[PDB]
Amino acid sequence: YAHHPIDYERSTSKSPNILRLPANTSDPTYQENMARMEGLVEQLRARVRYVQAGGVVPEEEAAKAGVSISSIEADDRVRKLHLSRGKMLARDRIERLIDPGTRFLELSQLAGWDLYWDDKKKEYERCYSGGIVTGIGLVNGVRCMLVANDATVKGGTYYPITVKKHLRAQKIAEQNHLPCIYLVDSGGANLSRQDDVFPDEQHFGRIFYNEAQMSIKSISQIAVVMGSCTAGGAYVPAMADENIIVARNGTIFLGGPPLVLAATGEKVSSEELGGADVHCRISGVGDHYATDDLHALYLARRAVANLNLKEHNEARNPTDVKPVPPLYDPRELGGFIPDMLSDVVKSFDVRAIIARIVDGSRFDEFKALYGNTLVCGFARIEGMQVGIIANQGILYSESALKGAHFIGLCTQRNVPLLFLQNITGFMVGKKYEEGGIARNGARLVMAVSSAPVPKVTVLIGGSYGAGNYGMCGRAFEPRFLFMWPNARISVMGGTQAATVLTLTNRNLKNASEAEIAAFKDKVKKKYEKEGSCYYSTARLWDDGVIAPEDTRVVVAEALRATRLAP
Amino acid sequence: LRARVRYVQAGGVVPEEEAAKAGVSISSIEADDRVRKLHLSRGKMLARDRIERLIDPGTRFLELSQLAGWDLYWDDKKKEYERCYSGGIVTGIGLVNGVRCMLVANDATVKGGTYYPITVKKHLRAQKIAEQNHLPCIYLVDSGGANLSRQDDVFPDEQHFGRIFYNEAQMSIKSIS
Amino acid sequence: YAHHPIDYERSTSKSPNILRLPANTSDPTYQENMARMEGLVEQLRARVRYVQAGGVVPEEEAAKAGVSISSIEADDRVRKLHLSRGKMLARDRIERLIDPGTRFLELSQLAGWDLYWDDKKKEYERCYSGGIVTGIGLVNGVRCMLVANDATVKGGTYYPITVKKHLRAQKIAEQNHLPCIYLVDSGGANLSRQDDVFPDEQHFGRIFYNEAQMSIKSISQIAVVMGSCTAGGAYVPAMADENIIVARNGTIFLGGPPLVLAATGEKVSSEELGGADVHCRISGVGDHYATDDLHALYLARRAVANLNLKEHNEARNPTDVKPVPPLYDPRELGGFIPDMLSDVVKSFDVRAIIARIVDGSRFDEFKALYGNTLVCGFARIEGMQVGIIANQGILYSESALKGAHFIGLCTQRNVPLLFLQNITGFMVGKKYEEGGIARNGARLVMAVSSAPVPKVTVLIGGSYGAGNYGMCGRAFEPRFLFMWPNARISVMGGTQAATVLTLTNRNLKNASEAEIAAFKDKVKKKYEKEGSCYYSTARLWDDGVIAPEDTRVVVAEALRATRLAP
Ligand SMILES: O=CCCCC[C@@H]1SC[C@@H]2NC(=O)N[C@@H]21
Ligand SMILES: O=CCCCC[C@@H]1SC[C@@H]2NC(=O)N[C@@H]21
């Protein structure tokens, strides 16, 4: 009918239905939300600074961070003493190591935030980081995993949060075939929590297991020995394609200098006990002997160069690309996010978020009239086709079917998946249970777990209960996890668990007010005591923590990380 | 050769009425024009137009099988053959959005019945070609159901209407969407 | 509760629930059914005899077969003339070729039964067979496909039913890796239906295509040239690992003896034109030159011996096994089958049939309370575990789901499948259509076609319409098909098509009786004019035709045929 184009015009124009046009009006509601978000990011963006240069914050105005006041002078004294030795006490080794003008990720940050409670009731162990810093680094045109042991040995070298971080880094590198670089500085072991860190599985032995399984798959790895690595820490220099020992302060020992005493205590110099022995000794241990920190870092870079990965990365990830920005300003991402601590769940939207994040502000909807709860479709993220699952409302059987169908197509055509978690939302109606809802949930989870597609999840907010099993979860092998500040990970019910567990717990009929004070308030305190900031990341649950505004850059880092894969 | 093509194209409606270069018998042009008018009033394009709308401009096309079912069946009327201007479908290789694809379109000719022993064979030939060459298929579906007259010839046995369903699953096994 | 066994006793006893105890009472209803069956088998079992020794039935009492009287004297004269030549005119070559005490199948029989209508109105072409005889034969401990060209050349060598039979045999052999043996006697081609048999595809060229594709897969094939094979028939002796030419009457030609005349007509002896030339000619054509029929058959057997397949077959199919019979008498199979030509569908059962066929009369039911329409479960057939799908009633969505689940398990564990076809039975209710019944039917057909498991189907009765797409059909690659006498293969409706097509066909409101006489009676005649005996097998639709009583033996032949497969 008076309409005869050739699909384009209708396409390739600034007027295709594919795009999205949710324009906000900045009203009170927007302000209430936008403002809060701002109230939910300032310190997130801040604590980072405090742990960075940990314990030395000369401004002394860090009231925006709820961190307790710490003895700045002690940390400054320790840093001065350490830097007088001739080694750089910072993450400086990293940004010296990575090529200028390139990107970085800082995979796990704020690790071990106020984790352990000391004997002093008001004092926690001052683990500003997990004892290491981990991030994806691009060296000499080669993408690599960077792990650096921090010089914080006051509490002890490695904790249940340190070895877990190291093992997570090793698993990520092995999955993605990114070579690792380890910067080694250790105080040995922790002889206090040794039962928690040494024996059992997924412990310090699995590091040695991984450093051999990698070299089986011919994924070369490199370690730099800046200081002592004793107590089983001396095997990494031994199990290494290339290793670096600094001329003066680089030391490697299987038995400590105190250990020779009380067992043939003919004590001699710490150099002769296994440290950097530049005298043409009989031992052929340690590939590189470098006179200075810069010399060692330079030789590490030079060894990284001769791996032939530059051609493969350059072919797989195009270095010269034209950035395509979204149609709407990314600062608006905080506004559509609702507020917090609201008796009844507030309202929420997804279209706006996806239209703000994706390229050209576009989307490819599958069936949206049907199973209106769940959202699935294709997209574009900086030159790469992506699939997104974002959740909105209370799940039905049909939503599970649609999810299974989408995941089937994505696995069929080798399209990566992105997850945006939300509430559990399993209806409890009797008719729904009689309609085989459990079978359809199984249909969804089977497809989720069976998918060989790389998978990344990011918390939008309100991910509580067994609903994440429908979409995705840490136990379903997501190659990366990141989080927004307004996240709560809890039991099958965030608010309802309060009501349900109020009924069935040794309660007399009378004393109703005192009981709800003792029951409902207490369970609310329990189920929102956990949050994005503490229960997560600090314990390497969903290790990555980010800002809602800069999500697309992070996801693009992740996707470039997962295309060197076999 | 170059001409009959034109006649089956816009089949049965040749306003020039000078198609003596084609030995085709004179057909009731008014009936076909009436049918096409009624069909286009419905809101759907009665032609191969769906195809050249679907394929990118400036690109090529093949029209794999043409003149299909040319004067094939002899009707009860001795001087009349069944007016199957095409095989009931049109098949050609099409390049869509930079992607080469097989295009199969069911014609709206349902006067004789949807599918014949020449229609299912054309569809199956297209499916075999696509599977051999790993070109994805696009089917434009318009049907009058089945043909309950030659049903023994088209429904049972092998290489029939079931093999279409067989191929549409064997393709998705090989991940050829 | 006072019950503490160890599973057996409860098991390994003559009282396990696994078995089945449907005992008949031989009542009128049984008689009506049992008797009819008997009325449905006598001639089935008989025509076989008539085509066997075709056209020569000395009893002349073959009134039990509706076959028209034929000139017996002419056929006897032809057979006498042919046997005077020195070659055995019968299937005798086969049972001479196969080891004594072994089995045989006769894959396609009654082929080309009264197919073509001649110029004479009351006369059909006398193709007692398809011109060939095909059956699975076990030679020298090696299972092989046997194809023998009958000496019936009165109508012409090969027909649209002959080449289809040959190609079906070749496809079966290639799928099952059974070597073929061809017994070649030809009158050349048929220059009357040549357009129907020579050009196009799936024709005489595909025989030559298959005889080369087999030798690519190293599946050796053997041909015996008893008489002339001209008109493209001379390539099979040329395309053969081993070929046999009889000393006197074995001839091979690319150009006929009449063909030399009118084109340099220097006629010479038919021996010199390409026949058996035992004079040490320059041609190295034809491996074996045998003085007698027995000598040629013996050399064929000797060549078959040196293939090394005996060890592989003996390992795969155990030669020394203990037969386990069912608990109930197989003669009762005809009784549970209802009668025929009944206005409204009669009643039917399945349990009894499966309990009569399987080993030990046992079964392994999946969910039978749910989707009570369709039947699926495991079984035992002569030492081999089997899966059976037998249909009973009108299909639902849940029946399709159960079928898909069963086929999934069977493919997962590599269990063969058996099909017992029945009515279409797709409900037309609006609520059922609104419940996504089409999606569930697609779910079923997808699993049916995708299954790599060997598949065999046998017609129980009433297989009409698109319902077979749910279970299985010829277009879904069943490696064998067999049929019972009471079978009807028709449009989506056997009885209802009459009612529906009565309404919508140029009918005036009045003249109702004359119209139903002209409409309903006519469509009934059309939709039951087709049947098991004519429309099937004779046209190689479901090529195998059997008796209901001897089904388990046939299915056991089929399963042993499908374990030499790769
Ligand atoms: O429309 C009313 C039904 C609401 C169901 C909410 C589901 S039921 C289980 C889960 N726990 C909750 O508190 N909400 C979800
Ligand atoms: O109970 C009433 C429903 C009857 C369904 C009859 C089924 S629907 C498809 C098939 N075609 C027929 O003519 N009858 C069956």
Side-chain angles (χ1 to χ4, degrees), chain C residues 184 204 208 229-237 253-254:
Chain C
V184 188
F204 207 61
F208 315 129
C229 45
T230 68
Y235 269 131
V236 187
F253 301 111
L254 267 183

Side-chain angles (χ1 to χ4, degrees), chain C residues 56-110:
Chain C
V56 183
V57 178
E59 72 177 1
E60 299 301 320
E61 293 173 345
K64 187 69 171 67
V67 58
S68 307
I69 314 300
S70 300
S71 177
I72 317 293
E73 50 85 21
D75 292 338
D76 202 23
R77 218 188 317 105
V78 175
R79 291 208 174 199
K80 293 187 286 185
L81 297 192
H82 188 274
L83 283 154
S84 84
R85 278 286 297 163
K87 32 179 180 175
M88 323 163 81
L89 191 143
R91 301 142 56 122
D92 294 334
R93 304 141 161 180
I94 285 178
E95 69 272 16
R96 305 285 164 174
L97 192 83
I98 315 172
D99 276 346
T102 62
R103 296 184 155 196
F104 196 55
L105 199 56
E106 194 183 2
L107 191 73
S108 179
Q109 52 188 354
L110 313 186

Side-chain angles (χ1 to χ4, degrees), chain A residues 125-127 152-159 189-193:
Chain A
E125 171 56 287
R126 304 176 182 181
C127 282
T152 177
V153 294
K154 312 94 183 173
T157 299
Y158 61 79
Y159 285 166
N190 191 20
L191 277 67
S192 160
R193 266 165 272 287

Side-chain angles (χ1 to χ4, degrees), chain B residues 121 148 151-152 155-158 161-163 165-166 169-170 173, chain C residues 446 449-450 465-466 469 474-477 490-491 527 535 540-541:
Chain B
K121 199 192 308 178
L148 277 67
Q151 193 268 5
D152 59 354
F155 185 89
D157 201 5
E158 202 265 316
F161 207 61
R163 203 172 175 83
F165 315 129
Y166 176 54
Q170 201 71 15
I173 301 299
Chain C
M446 185 48 225
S449 65
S450 68
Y469 299 154
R474 174 43 72 62
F476 294 69
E477 280 260 358
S490 295
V491 306
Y527 292 167
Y535 277 62
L540 259 69
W541 312 355

Side-chain angles (χ1 to χ4, degrees), chain A residues 189 245 278 328 357:
Chain A
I245 313 160
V278 186
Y328 288 112
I357 292 185

Side-chain angles (χ1 to χ4, degrees), chain A residues 394 425-428 492 496:
Chain A
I394 301 299
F426 268 129
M427 300 265 177
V428 70
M492 203 166 46
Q496 211 65 11

